[PDB]
């Protein structure tokens, strides 16, 4: 096809294996915020990987905003090391990538009406709710947001291979509806 999606956000969950004090973490950390009335976790941000992580008292942490798998793992390790520097026995256990988000452009307008007519079993086009068509691919469990401008956003992937395979599957279909 000659086009490869580029990742825009990666969500990864890792367990530190130890209970934590959210108030102490908020008081002692650099960029952390804690609002128990609003949310039950602690939100921290690191600029060099340009990511944000949520840390829970159960010891499980979620890292989002990373553009690459390596960046996600490094950012999660950095957050764990920050928590460890705060005196806690933080570890790096069962790190896993829960979700990946990729974006790309097909460089031509798309007739979403014909696409939903042809693939009604997988398509969902409701301009009232959202201008982009929602396509639920089955062989890879990927949800694709297709827009009339040609931009395609893929989400729900665990590995980059799923993103690339889903785009490879969707590209001939979209080429069939070029405007």
């Amino acid at each position: 096809s000659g086009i490869v999606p580029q990742l825009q956000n990666i969500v990864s969950t890792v367990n530190l294996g130890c209970k934590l004090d959210l108030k102490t973490i908020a008081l002692r950390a650099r960029n952390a915020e804690y609002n128990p009335k609003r949310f039950a976790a602690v939100i921290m941000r690191i600029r060099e990987p340009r990511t944000t992580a949520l840390i829970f008292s159960s010891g499980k942490m979620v890292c989002t905003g990373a553009k690459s798998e390596e960046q996600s793992r490094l950012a999660a390790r950095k957050y764990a090391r920050v928590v460890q520097k705060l005196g806690f026995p933080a570890k790096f256990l069962d790190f896993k990538i829960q979700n990946m988000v990729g974006s790309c452009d097909v460089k031509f307008p798309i007739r979403l009406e014909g696409l939903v007519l042809t693939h009604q079993q997988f398509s969902s086009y409701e301009p009232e709710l959202f201008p982009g068509l929602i396509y639920r691919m089955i062989k890879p469990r990927i949800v694709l947001l297709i827009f009339v401008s040609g931009k395609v956003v893929l989400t729900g992937a665990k590995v980059r291979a799923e993103i690339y395979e889903a785009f490879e599957n969707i590209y001939p279909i979209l080429k069939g509806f070029r405007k």
């Binding site: 609002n35 128990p36 009335k37 609003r38």
Partner: protein, 88 residues
Amino acid sequence: TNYKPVANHQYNIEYERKKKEDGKRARADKQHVLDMLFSAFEKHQYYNLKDLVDITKQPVVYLKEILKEIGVQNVKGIHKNTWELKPE
């Protein structure tokens, strides 16, 4: 003009804004919650769980756990079985 199309009813958006600004009640430390509970009991002997939740401003499950630790439910002819804040 009747039943004009609106994205969301005005009263609902006002109520949602108030709830969002207030936020969910936070789970405070056991010591402070216990102290507040004891002062409330000092006001007078009998409290219902709903108004006790209002007074303490704590989650219902957490408050119920702390109250089960010390207080005891008495079945009474007031209206119903309610909590007793006296530990004994």
